Design a protein around this ligand. Structure first.
Ligand SMILES: CCCCCCCCOC[C@H](COP(=O)(O)OCCN)OP(=O)(O)CCCCCCC
Ligand SMILES: CCCCCCCCOC[C@H](COP(=O)(O)OCCN)OP(=O)(O)CCCCCCC
Ligand SMILES: [Ca+2]
Ligand SMILES: [Ca+2]
Lengths: 123, 123
């Protein structure tokens, strides 16, 4: 769920408030997304969005009532590293992996304030 | 919370259904407890019960509305090892540690079926 995603990003970037720093960035960081990513951080979000799209094609994810945003999973943050838990069933484990990869990606690319609240006429 | 405790014990003992195997064992394994522990597994539960008693004396635990049984925390199981997450605030982190120690203890001591549903006239 989004609140585990928030925690994961804070696990990799301790000084960040993810929902504030990463929401509405470029063409992909935020709900939805379309167009050509404006930079690498935007590209991280595009991959993450694609990952969630894959998750929805999974039969395991089809039986659940929760969508990737509300579907809770278990993970731990220890020494700034994310570990998806073996207690997650197939769907939640897939989502957990998507979120983990995106958090690490965010932590490895440049942040361009100029792309915050990017006008969607470039997407 | 109890459901994280259940998962933790299954993390260390994969073939077990904890709520069935460990509830109502000896004088301490189960709600409450009193008397002299009947064996080492019972002793594990006595330490765990003492741990929860410590948790309640914590000011951090006092402000919460959830008791140790309903207080949710985050942990992961990976390769049969338990990791309490840095995302836990003081209270939940204390509880997480109590549960982790008890799961490991359970996994290291003998299980005596003769003590299952032990008559509380020995406690
Ligand atoms: C209830 C209000 C909360 C809305 C703010 C978060 C936007 C949605 O995040 C989910 C997705 C992706 O899901 P979708 O964009 O809806 O599309 C997924 C299918 N492609 O992540 P993202 O890669 O777009 C970047 C999120 C970072 C912001 C910080 C949140 C912790
Ligand atoms: C809603 C019904 C569920 C009840 C069954 C579990 C009993 C309570 O477990 C909590 C405590 C300890 O809390 P208390 O005994 O109530 O006393 C704590 C303060 N001393 O653990 P324990 O060390 O006594 C052993 C639990 C193993 C059983 C499997 C559960 C996953
Ligand atoms: Ca998006
Ligand atoms: Ca007990």
């Amino acid at each position: 769920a989004l609140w585990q995603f928030n925690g994961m990003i804070k696990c990799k970037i301790p000084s960040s408030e993810p929902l504030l720093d990463f929401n509405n960035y470029g063409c992909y960081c935020g709900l939805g997304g379309s167009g050509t990513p404006v930079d690498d951080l935007d590209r991280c979000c595009q991959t993450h969005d694609n990952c969630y799209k894959q998750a929805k094609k999974l039969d395991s994810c089809k039986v659940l009532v929760d969508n990737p945003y509300t579907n809770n999973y278990s993970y731990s943050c220890s020494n700034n590293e994310i570990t998806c838990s073996s207690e997650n069933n197939a769907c939640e484990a897939f989502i957990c992996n998507c979120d983990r990869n995106a958090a690490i990606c965010f932590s490895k690319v440049p942040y361009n304030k100029e792309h915050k609240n990017l006008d969607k006429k470039n997407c």
